[PDB]
Design goal:
The structure is cut from a larger assembly and holds chains A, B and C.
Chain A lengths: L43 E15 L11 E10 L3 E12 L2 E9 L5 H5 L21 H14 L2 E7 L14 E5 L5 H9 L5 E2 L1 H4 L5 E7 L5 E2 L1 H5 L34 E2 L4 E13 L34 E5 L9 E6 L7 H4 L4 E4 L13 H8 L4
Antiparallel strand pairs in A: 1-2, 1-13, 1-14, 2-12, 3-4, 3-5, 3-7, 5-6, 8-11, 8-13, 9-10, 11-12
Chain B lengths: L3 E2 L6 E2 L5 E4 L5 E4 L2 H8 L11 H6 L4
Chain C lengths: L10 E3 L3 E3 L8 E7 L11 E2 L4 E5 L12 E7 L4 E2 L5 E3 L4 E4 L11 E5 L1 H6 L1 H6 E4 L1
Parallel strand pairs in C: 10-11
Antiparallel strand pairs in C: 1-4, 2-3, 3-5, 5-6, 6-9, 7-8
Chain A binds five RNA strands through strand 1, strand 2, strand 3, strand 4 and strand 6.
Chain lengths: 380, 62, 132
RNA sequence: UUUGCCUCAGGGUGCUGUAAACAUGAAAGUAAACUUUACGAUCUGUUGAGGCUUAUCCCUAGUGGUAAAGUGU
RNA sequence: CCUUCGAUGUCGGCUCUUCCUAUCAUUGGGACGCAGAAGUCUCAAAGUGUCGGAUUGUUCACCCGCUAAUAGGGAACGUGAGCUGGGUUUAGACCGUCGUGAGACAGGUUAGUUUUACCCUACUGAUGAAUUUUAUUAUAUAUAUACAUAUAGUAUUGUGACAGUAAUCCAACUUGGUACGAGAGGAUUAGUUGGUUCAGACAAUUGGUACAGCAAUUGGUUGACAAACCAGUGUUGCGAAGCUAAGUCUGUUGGAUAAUGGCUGAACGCCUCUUAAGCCAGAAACCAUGCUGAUUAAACAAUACUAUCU
RNA sequence: GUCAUCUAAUUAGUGACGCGCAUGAAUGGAUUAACGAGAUUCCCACUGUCCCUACUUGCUAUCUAGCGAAACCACAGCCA
RNA sequence: AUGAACUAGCCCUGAAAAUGGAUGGCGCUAAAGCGGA
RNA sequence: UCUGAUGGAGGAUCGAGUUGAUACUGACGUGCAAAUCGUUCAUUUCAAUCACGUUUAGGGGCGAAAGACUAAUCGAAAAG
């Protein structure tokens, strides 16, 4: 018979199966729709989750209970050393999907890039990409001309530089970033002129911009149904334990449905969150990356004692409003919004008032080590 | 940037860190951290805690 | 006349006994329902600072006793986050007996009143001695 | 898997809360000599000291080490 | 009384999922004895949601209250190797009535053991080979070829058939004391700011957590100090890191339609939305978009390097 | 059952009413201080019972070396 | 060649149920349907 | 009559042990165990507990009474 009291199901069926992700790297399922009018431009970037802090900003929301008052907001730091563009891949549409026409490489690729092709680089002869790169320029131009003539989707192979990060990993994360913009004539030259040079984050993204984040969530091994799906605990008197679903299906159908929550893997899931606002794009060069015009102090984004479980951010970074899936050191792929947003939050120009760099280990009271030593005075 | 003063200790509280507490009389107190909040709630006087700035002042070793 | 209350950490579920903090005559309020609470299966209706609740008095004048009457929370002992970046909590939970329209049936509030409740209910702020 | 990594150490960052020892130092008082000497919870100075801090914290071409070379194609 | 008496565990509740629509609310309409407001009848529509409690074993019921609404049902009266065991329904015992009696009661009451999964499948997660009578949306300097092409290992980047899918509702204020109305009252729609439920993450902050760590201390014990140890974690404070919610962040727009309202327009000299042909606008529905898997396609592509090889 | 009370809400409890299906006097009637691992209702205190779960410890589980059963079994095991 | 009223063939409304679903399936409309020959 | 001591009665009280077995309707339920384990609980000067010896034997015994017990067997034991 019917349920005495209805209530919504537990968990979303749209994230099934809750299995382990294939890869640690976030994979873009789809890029934003191509707009012919806009000039050619990159669409995605890669960084690493360094940690998070909080900032103070002045709200400019009229008719809100906050408005003129200053607000503390949590923000994630994603270290983004410049990516290196190394390849061009052209796609053409077929009734069977997108088909690669060919990929064209640059004349030189980093050892960091070549490491990604090896499982045992240290014992290898490192012979990858050694004799396919000295191909004559005539064939290169022929391949680009055929891509121009036939292809309709262009992507640039680009890779990260983990040597510029505190990561133990040495092999680069490589991925293709789709170029959206003018015709293929313009797309090809836009990528060719950047076929070897570094790609900084500032080229891809602007401050105060909404972006999507693609990353693999934090893993938790196998978890019970109570933690995995949020089912209600059974009463204390239950004979064979209470941390389980009581009825896992009616008599008929004489099967267990796939919609029934069960124990299994929790975390390490691929996720694509939308609408994370970039609060600041901090640069490697400047010494006031974490300073605001209302603070005028000389400090960088890394909190005293370093980002816990990550290290020091010595490169470009972006301060992302809110949280992002994944642990520290997790590679986060930032993607341009699928459709540009004209909402008030999307178009808002945030004015950062203060960025906290106190120790994230324990409860830090100081913003800088100099401030700490000045406060305590001389010691033994 | 403008920081407040902790009530149990003299430490500076930067924005987004501490916690406030209002007594019966409407008197408001600010505490930097959970330790200070706990000690104030158990009503331990900072003057008798060796590591506190109040103790340092009362023993004249600033 | 503006109900953009902004979320405050929920405390005071149904069945909580709080102080009356007013000169209406009652000494405590027994929360039996929270106005505007929706429908979740085993969720106890819980109230926050500015929330209007339905309550009965267990100690107080007999004309106030044994009746269902509206109250408005003014002090809460559960820490809640002010958007300026800190957390606040009182020493006790307290609310004032009020007309379902929103005007207090007493005349004064004994203790401090949270600013979140004050800006939500105008005449409560007028009758409040100390606003925190 | 040799500009790495592990290790210990140093530094940072924190957590706790001021270590052991010494002091014709204090200490409610006590007793014992021809004014000093014994006992004394506890307190003070040296002492924001001492201890701990990755094992899933941060930095360091700082120390020492980085092993046999087996299996499939 | 058709099956089951060499046994299909027979009430209710809790838990959890799915389905139906004879739709309670939400979406868009038509009618009204429709001024507005509120409401009633009705159509397309099952996407989303349908609550907290007092009494009772109850289903049913009835009140208190919130709500937008607190709709009706199915799944062996869904669900006992899921629980519980209050009731019913063994043996003890009490009362009332009945019986000469043993005893009876579709009368009341109290106490009364709830067994097994390690098998198959299903489901949830986790490894993983093999795949030529197999595959092909091309491959070749405006130009031929299936009478062809394709060895294999590692490795990366991809394609994405197919399967799943997700957001939901409310309030206040502005429009506006406006339209309407004699007044009394009093909107729709749009916008703004918030919130409920749900979903997916996250730990900067707050809180929780302690067999990291420091400190204190009771009983005992090592002659004392020191250092300790035992008391199944001796007890206390504080307690980083890590987990964690009660904390924090995020949660699209297109196509084609249904109801309905229409266009042109015969049938039927007129008329007619078509109850002909030919068209339009149109819903929380549908399909896409987006998201999740893709040893769900025993699937495939491009690239890098190589195996005495060709 | 009706009326009071208890609650916010009382098929519960208690106090009353009594043409009592079918109460009643050693089938013992009415009442009783003290006593009870007896049945029942309410209040204070208390708390993870609950809102709404989280973290944590021991012993298992788990993987390995060794040792090593049983119940059950027509044949078997995807669905509409 | 107009207005009516009947009549009876096929079609339509009447015609709502729970796992997903069944003229046996695919499908079929110049039938692969209905009634004949 | 009242007050303070003394005194040490009671099928008096708490409570280990002993003797049991209220609850978790906990564990276990292919058990350590054909009744156990843990916590909780009842009992301790008496109608108290224990041992050995001895009596009562089956339509019989024995029963502070449950159709209880009478060698894992009881609304008529076990053996032939």
């Amino acid at each position: 018979s019917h349920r005495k009291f209805e209530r919504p199901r537990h968990g979303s069926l749209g994230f099934l199966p809750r299995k382990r992700c294939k890869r640690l790297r976030g994979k873009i399922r789809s890029f934003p729709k191509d707009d012919k009018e806009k000039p050619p431009h990159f669409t995605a970037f890669m960084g690493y989750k360094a940690g998070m802090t909080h900032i103070v900003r002045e709200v400019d929301k009229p008719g809100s209970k906050l408005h003129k008052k200053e607000i503390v907001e949590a923000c994630t730091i994603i270290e983004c050393a410049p990516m290196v563009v190394v390849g061009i891949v052209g796609y053409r549409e077929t009734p069977k999907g997108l088909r690669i026409l060919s990929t064209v490489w640059a004349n030189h690729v980093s050892d960091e890039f070549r490491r990604r092709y090896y499982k045992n680089w240290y014992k290898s002869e490192k012979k990858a990409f050694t004799k396919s790169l000295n191909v004559p320029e005539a064939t290169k131009n022929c391949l680009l001309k055929r891509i121009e003539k036939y292809c309709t989707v262009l992507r640039a192979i680009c890779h990260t530089q983990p040597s510029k990060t505190p990561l133990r990993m040495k092999k680069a994360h490589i991925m293709e970033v789709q170029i959206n913009g003018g015709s293929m004539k313009e797309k090809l030259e836009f990528v060719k002129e950047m076929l070897e040079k570094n790609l900084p984050v500032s080229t891809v993204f602007n401050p105060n911009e909404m972006i999507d984040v693609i990353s693999v969530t934090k893993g938790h091994g196998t978890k019970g149904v109570v933690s995995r799906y949020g089912v209600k605990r059974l009463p204390r008197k239950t004979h064979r334990g209470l941390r389980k679903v009581a009825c896992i299906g009616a008599w008929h159908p004489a099967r267990v449905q796939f919609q029934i929550p069960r124990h299994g893997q929790k975390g390490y899931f691929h996720r694509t969150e939308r609408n994370k606002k970039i609060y600041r794009i901090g640069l490697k060069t400047d010494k006031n990356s974490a300073s605001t015009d209302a603070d005028i102090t000389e400090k960088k984004i890394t909190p005293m004692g370093g980002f816990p479980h990550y290290g020091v951010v010595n490169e470009d970074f972006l301060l992302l409003k809110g949280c992002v899936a994944g642990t520290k050191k997790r590679p986060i792929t930032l993607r341009k919004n699928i459709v540009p947003q004209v909402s008030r939050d999307a178009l808002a120009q945030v004015s950062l008032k203060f960025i906290d760099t106190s120790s994230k280990i324990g409860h830090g009271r100081f913003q800088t080590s100099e401030e700490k030593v000045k406060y305590y005075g001389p010691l033994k | 940037v403008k920081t407040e003063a902790c009530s149990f200790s003299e430490y500076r509280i930067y924005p987004g860190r501490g916690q406030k507490y209002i007594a019966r009389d409407g008197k408001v107190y600010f505490y930097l951290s959970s330790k200070f909040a706990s000690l104030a709630l158990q009503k331990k006087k900072a003057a008798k805690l060796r590591w506190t700035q109040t103790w340092r002042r009362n023993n004249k070793k600033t | 006349t503006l109900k953009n209350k902004m979320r405050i950490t929920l405390s005071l579920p149904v069945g909580a006994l709080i102080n009356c903090c007013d000169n209406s005559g009652g000494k405590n309020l027994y929360i039996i329902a929270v106005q505007g609470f929706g429908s979740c299966l085993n969720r106890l209706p819980a109230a926050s600072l500015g929330d209007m609740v339905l309550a009965t008095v267990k100690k107080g004048k007999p004309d106030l006793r044994k009746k269902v009457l509206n109250a408005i929370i003014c002090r809460q002992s559960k820490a809640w986050r002010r958007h300026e970046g800190y957390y606040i909590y009182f020493e006790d939970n307290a609310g004032v007996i009020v007309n379902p329209k929103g005007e207090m049936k007493g005349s004064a509030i004994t203790g401090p009143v949270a600013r979140e409740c004050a800006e939500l209910w105008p005449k409560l702020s007028s009758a409040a001695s100390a606003i925190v």
